[PDB]
Design a protein around this ligand. Sequence first.
Ligand SMILES: *[C@@H]1O[C@H](CO)[C@@H](O[C@@H]2O[C@H](CO)[C@@H](O)[C@H](O)[C@@H]2O)[C@H](O)[C@H]1NC(C)=O
Ligand SMILES: *[C@@H]1O[C@H](CO)[C@@H](O)[C@H](O)[C@H]1NC(C)=O
Lengths: 48, 49
Amino acid sequence: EVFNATRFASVYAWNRTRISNCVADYSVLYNFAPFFAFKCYGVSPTKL
Amino acid sequence: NDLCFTNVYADSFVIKGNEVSQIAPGQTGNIADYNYKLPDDFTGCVIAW
Ligand SMILES: *[C@@H]1O[C@H](CO)[C@@H](O[C@@H]2O[C@H](CO)[C@@H](O)[C@H](O)[C@@H]2O)[C@H](O)[C@H]1NC(C)=O
Ligand SMILES: *[C@@H]1O[C@H](CO)[C@@H](O)[C@H](O)[C@H]1NC(C)=O
């Protein structure tokens, strides 16, 4: 529900959503976007 | 050309433009994790044209 939206807000008003009380399996995050840059700093996708 | 290599391995594979950026020592993606993963201590280079 965060990746397939239609009106990702502009950078001047960056909409923020809170993710909690669920189980995260980022394979859906992987397959829902043709990734161009997954530059992470404090964490890594292989074990996310 | 100032180097003496014991053995040279020459793998070739045709692949997309962004997966050219994907292939690197220790990367991730649909290809870097399920098709061709390079070693983290990779002593060698890749060529793309
Ligand atoms: C940021 O984007 C979220 C997308 O999941 C919005 O959440 C939705 O908000 C609508 C109301 O606008 C709810 O009806 C819906 O159930 C869901 O919670 C979120 O509102 C949005 N935030 C801002 C500030 O635009
Ligand atoms: C939800 O994701 C699907 C798959 O990408 C997409 O076709 C659909 O338009 C998305 N929903 C909305 C409301 O955009």
